[PDB]
Each structure stands twice: as C-alpha cells, then as structure tokens.
Amino acid sequence: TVCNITANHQFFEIPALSAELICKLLELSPPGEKSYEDLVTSTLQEALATTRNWLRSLFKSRMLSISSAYVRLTYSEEMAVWRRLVEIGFPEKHGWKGSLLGDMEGRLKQEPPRLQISFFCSSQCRDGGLHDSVSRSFEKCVIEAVSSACQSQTSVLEGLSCQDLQKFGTLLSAVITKSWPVHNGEPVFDVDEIFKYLLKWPDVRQLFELCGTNEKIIDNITEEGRQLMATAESVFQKVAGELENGTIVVGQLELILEHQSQFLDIWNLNRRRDVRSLLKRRRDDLLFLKQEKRYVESLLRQLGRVKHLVQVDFGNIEIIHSQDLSNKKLNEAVIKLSYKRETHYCLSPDIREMA
Amino acid sequence: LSLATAINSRGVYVIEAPKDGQKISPDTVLRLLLPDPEALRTYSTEELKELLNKLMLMSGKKDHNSNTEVEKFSEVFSNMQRLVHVFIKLHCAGNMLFRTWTAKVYCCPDGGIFMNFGLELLSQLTEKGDVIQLLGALCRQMEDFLDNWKTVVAQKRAEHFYLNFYTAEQLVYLSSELRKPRPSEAALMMLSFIKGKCTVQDLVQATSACESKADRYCLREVMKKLPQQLLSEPSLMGKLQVIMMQSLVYMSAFLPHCLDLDALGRCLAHLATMGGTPVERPLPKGLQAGQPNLILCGHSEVLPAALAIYMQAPRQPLPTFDEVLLCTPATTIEEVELLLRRCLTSGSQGHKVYSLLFADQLSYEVGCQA
Amino acid sequence: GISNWALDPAKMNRGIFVSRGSPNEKELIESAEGICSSDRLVQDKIRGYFAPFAKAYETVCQKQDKEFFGLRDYYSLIKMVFAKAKASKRGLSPQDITHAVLRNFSGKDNIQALSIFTASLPEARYKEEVSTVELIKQNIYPGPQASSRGLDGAESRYLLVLTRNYVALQILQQTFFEGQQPEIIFGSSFPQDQEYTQICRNINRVKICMETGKMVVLLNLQNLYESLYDALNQYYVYLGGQKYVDLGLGTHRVKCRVHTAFRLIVIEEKDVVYKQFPVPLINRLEKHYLDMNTVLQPWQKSIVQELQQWAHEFADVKADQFIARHKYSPADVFIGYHSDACASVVLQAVERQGCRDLTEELYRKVSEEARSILLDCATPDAVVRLSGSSLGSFTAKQLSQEYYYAQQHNSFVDFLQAHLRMTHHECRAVFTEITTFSRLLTGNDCDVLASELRGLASKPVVLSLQQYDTEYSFLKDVRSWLTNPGKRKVLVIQADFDDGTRSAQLVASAKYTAINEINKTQGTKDFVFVYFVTKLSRMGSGTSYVGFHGGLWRSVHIDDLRRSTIMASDVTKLQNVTISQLFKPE
Lengths: 355, 370, 586
Hints:
It is classed as signaling protein. The entry lists the keywords nucleotide, AAA, RNF213, E3 ligase, activity based probe, signaling protein. This is part of a larger assembly, with three copies of chain A. By secondary structure, chain A is mainly α. Chain A is built from 15 helices and no strands. Chains in contact: A-C, B-C.
C-alpha cells in the first residue's frame, strides 16, 4: 500500500524505508522445521514482486533520452534510486541482487551502444563507489556495448571527454581485449595481422595518442591488456624500426603505401615516444621494382608467344620470377655511384631499354 | 496425339490374369483395346509407355484441349497401373479370390468400370460415372483389403503350425489339389515331408474328417441373405466391402472347389497325427535352449559345424527343408520368416533344432525384416 | 560406342578404336586458340594468357586426387575470358580474371585455385573481397550486353550448388530470385505416386520452361541424369536462328527448343556430389558452395550468436511461482527452434532490410527485426512467464507490448484482417506458415470465416492434406481454387502432425506443388495469400518441430485459430485485475 501511492521518483526514500523494514524484521528472528524458511522465502518473493511492479509502475519510458546532444536521464535522480534500493542487505542465498541487476541490464540493453557509451563519460554516471555492484553491472554492460559496437564497424572514441580516469581506462581495456584480431579466440603470434589491425582500425591511433599523452592511463588497465599492448607496440617498433634499413618485407611496404595517413599519424605520434623524403625514396624504389617486374613479364610472354618456334633459357630468372613477393627489400640493392639492381638479374641495361 | 484422343474416346483397359503358361509380370496382365470398320487393336503396356513418353515430350500446341487430353490419359493410365500394382500384390500374397479376377475400364466420358470374377455365384458388376474417382476409391479399397488379408493370413499361420511349412503359392497348389478325387503326384510327394510315405487313402481320410456340415448351413445362410444384402448398397464400394468381409470370415462360401486355411491346417495336423515317432533333438553342451545361439565359425567350418550340432541325437533321421535353412544372396524374406514361424510356434509334438546357415549372407533389407 | 571410362580389347578387335590419354600443354594452347579463333584481334591480345592457364590447369589437375576438374572447366575459362575480352575492347582487368577463375574453379574445398592461378600470374592480385553471392547473381542474371550476338557460345554452363542440410533454396529464394520465381522441379513425396510418371511430368515441366524461358531449380538429378545429360552438355542444333537440344525419355530422343534466356540450377549435398555423382557431371556444371557461412558476413554471424544467447536467456526462467523444477529450452518457448534457426532469422531480417551497408543504424534494426521474428512465433504463456526471466522486466514489458499490439496473435481471423490491409508493395503473393495447438478448421468454421470476410476476402478454400494420395488431386483442387473469379484469394492447407497419418514429410511437397502452380497459373491483377496451418501438441511434438523455413515463408504462431467469444483478447487486462475484481458489477 505504500508502493501504490508513490509516483514521483523523488520519493524513493519511502519504499526504501518500507523494504528496510522487512529487512530489519528478517534480520532479528530466530532460526527454529522448514516452515520458517518457506515463510521467509515467500515473504521476500512477495516483497520483491511488489518492488518490481512499483518500478515498472513509474518508469514508463526509456533511460537517457538525449534531445540536446547532451545525453541525460529523463528521470534525473534515477541512479540514486537504484543505489538506495539495491544496497539493502537481504540474505544472499536468495535473489534481490541477481534479479535487480538483471533488471538493470535489461533496461540498459534497450539503449543503442553509441548513446550508452556517450552517457558513460558524461559526468552523470559518476561515483565509482568501491564495488558498488550497480556500477559493476554498468561496467559489464558497457563492456558488452563496446563488444557490440566493435562487431559493427563504428569507431568508439571521437567525442569522449571522460576526465574520470578509472572508467576511461576500463573502456580502453574493453576496446583492446574485444577489438583484438581473434582467429577463433586470440591467436596472433605474428607481425602482419597485428599491423593491418593498427593501420585499418581508426580507434587504435586514438588509443595510442591517449595512452602516450599521459602515463596515468596505462597504469590502470588489466593483466591481459598490458601484454596485448606490449605485443602491439613491439610489433610496430619492430616494423617501423625495420624501415631505417631495407629489411622490410615488401608486403608490409604495399600495406603502408595503401595506408598512408594512419601510418603517418602513428609515426607522428611515435617521434615524441626525416619521414617525408624517406617515404618518397621507398615509394620510388617500390614503383621502380614493380615497373621493372612488368617489363620482365612482358618479355617472358613475348618469348612465350613464340614458345612453339624458338625456346629461350631465361638465365636464373625462371625461378626468381616464380617466387612470391613476401621477400625482403634489402636484396634489391638501390646502391649508389644511380642504378637499382634487383634479384631479377637483367643481363644488361640493353635489355632494359629493349624491354 | 489423335491416337491419345482415340484412347480417351473408346479405349478399354483390361486386367485379365493371363491364362497362358507365362508368369504374372505387370507386362502380361494389363492390355488396352481399341475398337473402330469393325476391327480392333490391342496394345500391351510397353507401347503405351513409349507413346506416353512421346506425348509428354512433344511440342506445345498451346491449347487447353491438347494438354487436358494428355493429362487425362496420363492420370487414367497411372491410376490404372496402380490398380495393376495392388492387384499383383494381392496375387503374389496368395488369395484365390482375386486369382480369377478381371476388370474392364471404359475411358469413354461416363464410361465406367465393368468388374467380373471367375465365379458362378457372383454377377457382372458395373458402374458408370467419373473414371478417376472410381479408380481412386477402388485402389484405396483394394489397399485396405491387402492389409486385412495379410492380417488374416498372419492369424491363420499363427494358429496352424504345419501351414508354415509352405509358401503362398505352395498353399494355393495344395488347396487346389486336396479337394480333387485324384490329386497330383507332386502334391502327394510334397506332403511326404509332414506324414512320410503318404498316399491317397490317408489323404481321403484326412479330407473327409476335417470339416463339419454346419459350415454348409452357414454358407447357405450367406447365399440366401446376400441378394437382399448387396441391394442395400447403391454403389460398387459397398457391395465389394460386403463381399470382401465375408470372404475374410467365410472363404469356402465363395470357392466351392478348394480348401480354406482352417481346413488345410486341420488336414495337415491330422496327416501329422497318422504318422508317429517324432524327432527329439538336444542342443549341444554349451548352447542355451531358450534364446538365440549366434555362433561365429569361419567360412570353411560352417557346414561341418551344423553337422556337429545335429549329432547330439544319432539314429534320429536327417533334416529336411524345415529346421535347416541355407541362407545365401537372393534369399527371399518368406523363407526366413517361415523358418522363424516353425521355430516359434506351438503345436509341434517334438523338439527340433532350427538352424540358419550363412545368415550373414542375407541382404540388408531381408536382415532388417527378419 | 562413345565412352568416358576405359574398355577391354576383346570388344575392339571388331572395329576401329580411338583412345586419347590427356591433352598436353601444346594441345591445350591449340584448343584455346581453336576456341578463340572466331575473332582475330582479341585472340591476338589474349594469347599471352593461354600457356599460363594451361600450366596452371595442369598443376591443378595434378594437385587434386579425385578428378574433380576437367577439360570443360578450362574450356569454359577460355570462353569466359574470351567473352570478357570481346565485350571489353581494352584488354583484361585483374578483376575480370579473378571473376573468371573464381566462377570456374570453385566447389572443391582443399584447392586454393586463386593462389594457384595467381602464382604464375603475379599481376592479377585482387586485394578486394569477391563474394560467392555476386558470382551466383551474374551466373543466373546476365544482362543485355551478354548473349546479344549471332549464336550463343559465351553462355555459362549451368549451376550446381553444393550444400549441407538442404539450405540452398532458402538463400536463393530470399537473396537472389528477383521478379519471377523459378519453377521448382522436385522429387514428390505424395504416397502411391509411381516414380516413372513423376519423372515424365518433371521432364515435361523442364521442357516447357526451356520453351518459355524461365528458370529451373532441380532438387533431384539422380532420377533425371539419364534424361538431361545432353542438355547439360550444351551442344545445340540451330534451325532458323533457334537452338535445339536433345532430350530423352526411355529410348525416345527429340530436339527440343531452348529459349535464349534459360538457366538451370541443381541443388545437391556436398557429400552426395563427392561420393555418388559419376563425374562427367561435376565437370559440366560450374560448382559453387553456399552453406550459411558463405552468405553471412562476420557481423551477421555475431548477430546470430547474440541472438542465440538472447533466446537461451529468453527461455531460461528462474522463478518459484509454483514449487517445481522445469527448466525451459528455447525449443519449448519458440515453436520451431532447432539450433540452426537464428541464422535463418538473421538472413530474413537482412533480406527485409534492402539497404545493406553496416552503419550502426542498420545493425540495431537488424537486431530488433530478428527479435521481432522470434517474438512473432512464441507461445503466449512464455510471454507471461517472461516477467521472471533473465532479461529483466522492462524488456519483458516492451516485448509484451510488441506481442499484443504490433503483432497479431489473437486468432486466425484477426491475423487475416490485419494481414490483408497491409499494403504489400512489389509482392503479388504473400506466403505465411502458421503453427497452432488448437484444432484445425472443420468446414463449419470455414463458413464463419467466410461470413466474417464478407467484404475483404474471396471465399477461402480450405484443403486438408491427409485427403490427398496423389499429387494430381491436390493440383486439381489448387487449380479449381485458382480458376474461381474474384481477387484477394485465400488458400488454407491443413496438416496435423499428431495422428496416425504420415503427413509430416508431405509438407515440403505440398508447398513446392502450390508454389509451382501459383507461379505458372496466377495472373497479374489478383493477389494470393496461402496459409499453411499445422497442428501441434504441447506433449513434446511442439518442441520436436523443425521450424523457421525461410525463402518465401513468413512464420507465425497463432495459438488458437478460433476467435473466442468468452474471454477478452488481451492478457494484460487479465494481468491487471484479480479474480474477485472480474466479478465486480457496474
């Protein structure tokens, strides 16, 4: 009879008192048969049934309707209600905590993931309250919203002003461990797939910018995220320290020329822990190798268009051309005093202008 | 095409059960007749199948009469061939009622079915109307009759033990032969496996002492009630249902020249009791006498091991086609089922060992059914 | 005596015997030049690719073990390359080469034919993904640029679609088949039909569809291979600028006319293809594989997994309203769930979208449409139990509001009167299967349904599926329903899965027969609404029911078919009041 006369939600104190009353009457009684246990279970069931029908009685709409690009609760003192009515201590062999938190996830998963993440850093999901369990519910739901927004191709963080640093580091740990390139569940062991992950996904450069701006974000991640961050950072350091010499596999060179802007951004982030002219030299040497390779296949097909008539022994080039271009660029010898000899040993420059 | 319209105008399908010495394949049961001058043209079913293939795949005229004539011919022929299918199932199951059956089917519009038996106490059945529904109802009726006939012959095989010695056509031949005053020597030698050195005096004693004279009173009661019992039904399905249920319950009322399964089973069990000294066989020391005894031998030592088994009682006479079955590829299911009926039914006056040699050599379907 | 397998010399001492082992590389490049000899400039442009394709084909046919690829594959590769080079007038892009290689040398699983054909051809690396669905779409649907010349030598072979668990036709009928549905030829399962007459009628339907030029989807071929191999060969006899191919029945061979736009698709299991087809057949049919992982993008697979988790927490309800332990499976809650249904649901949602580009405004509504598809086939006591479910109480609130106000689950008449007034755009026929636990409609209930559809429908013909031995009787009744006047026809086919009848594998044959007779018999002024209502039990048959068939079938669970004149048609109203307040006077 007191749940049926409060419909203003600033009056949550009154059903909070009327549920702390049955809490107090429960916490004083003596244990005896099984009539007392069935009695206390039945009375707690009826009390939470009345509580759930009250919360469905005055929450007849959604949460965090935006309407202003400044997403806010439409029942602005709602999180106070959930904090007060969840923190009261029933015996936890029953529900009241497996149920109301399931209620909060089902009310919160009614929201799209973009608006949920935009509210999560909006200074109204404040007071991370030292294992306040509704905040752990919201941590789990925001990690699930991160997982649902990374199964889609929408970049998460381009508007987050999230100066509470604990939840921001937890969201970053979420986006790392749930955006990482799994292959039936996290094998990487390599450098190529991790490097395509860095160059193609747009949240990675923002991640490295915000964790290299301040050391106060890398200190609170996980045990798992720092090993995966160390693996990604070792892969990028190995690859872009292999640009100073010619040892780069030309697959990674076609990848970085297809992905110019992201690589320039991450490298511009990396100088603070020349590159225009070094990219022009590597681009010129790549274009020279590919145009020299087009001449040799046109020569091979022209002598293959007369293959019935006169056959030619192609020096060593018959095997060198058959190999794939997962080969290292230092074997293609852009020496000075100039020419650029390759692994295709073209027997003179005569055959080069002929080709 | 105009041949197909002539079939749908005056063609007559004939099921005949051919009187010649040839077998009872579906190629030689069905015929088709065309009258005209005044000559006639008879088609077997292979030429109707080649014409239907030429007509289903001929060029589309794009007219409603053309494709409705091909569809009418194809549907009447498929229902008629399905009637042939159910008829051959009833034949090979062994029936002696639908043995001398015959049926003309008139493909005229409102042509009808003209049905006839090879019986003296029955009359020329006929019914006009829509041909496809008559064939559909007739085929459903004949399918229910095949299921009821298999149930009745199963319950006659279950209550008469010696009837399980013979297959369907062997029981048909014996039922035709024992009512004769001088039966054939092949019948009087195939019955030597039950009696032993059987002769005509033992057989006339058995066929005189089998059936009473109250069966005469109930068949005459049927013969006088049946004219005012057929005329209570307006259509053919009711008359056939009356004839088929009374053929189920009183078979010798329709066929007054052959024994039914009750009198055959009583005659065989009587022939069994004139000649005594039955066979008593023990199983060997290490074979249980209440369950299967599956034995795995190796292919060279199967045929000796059965001869090991049957020496547990010497001076008992040698086995015959009962109590040993030599299974092999192309062994039908009825041989195995009749051996299992000989092993698992009651009135046998002895103890005999029932063997399946090379029972692995059967096919998968025969093995699942067994 | 033509043969593909070898022969013994005791028969060929009679006459002359000609044997050929296998063509070597010079005979292959000579055969390629003999194909491309019909034009001079394109052949002298693309002679550079003949010897690479020949060496690459030889490495393919030596790499594999079963003789899966043969000379028709290389010949069709050369023909398709030659057709693209004729129609292009500039040469070959690597996109054209990778489409030719991947349309021709597909179907085999332990062969990476792109990597083999681009090992020797290092220019033709295509870094973009090529879906199997667009290769199937450009096999089935060529435009007016293709097949517009003298004769037809650049025509494709046909399709063979290899699958698991018989799931090609749903994908082909949602994603691919546009405008006019094909004429499905299938191995009919009506009882007491003879196989020979059904083969004859199926070949008649194939022959009519070759004449009129609509597509053919074969669901059997091991009955039809002897009668269609010369059509699969695609060698034509030209009379009057018209192509004629040989078709056979028994020993009867005739030349039948083939229309210039005719397509054939065989649908077959991957296993049956790999162990029962004789392999002239695999070489004639341009294989592709399409199971469900082929057509689903990875984010759609994540929607599938999230939806399975959503179903398993929709079903698993933890409450002590009655002191009993009965944990509910999502097969129990969703009548039809069979641990492969959520992929079908996600495919139905994506094909209801029509936009199809992943943008987080589409992803959310694919997820909500998938939840709506599951909710549209759930029992109402499950929606009442949903208050104590693991989802919550506001999710259960919005699902109950959708189940009782958006989706019509009252009765059969209300589903009609809400289904007829929906303005179906570009759908001339709307097909819905309905699952129920009530009794099926009698013939007195059909009169009430007709009188309550006095101004809307056109006297719904109700057919009972147990009353049909043969197929022709069913076709007679469907045609008698079709030839009646009036628009907005309604057909109701009725199966019962809980009785002594075998009418539980008749469902697919009935649906295929109905769909073929509608596609060949319906006009363009009348609309068609075919409902297939099936009767189930709560005694374990409602959970053993294989359910959410896609294609052109929308799946609903109406609980009772008959509009009740006793209780109110709203469970929420009964959920507000209690039993004493039900008897409260005015």
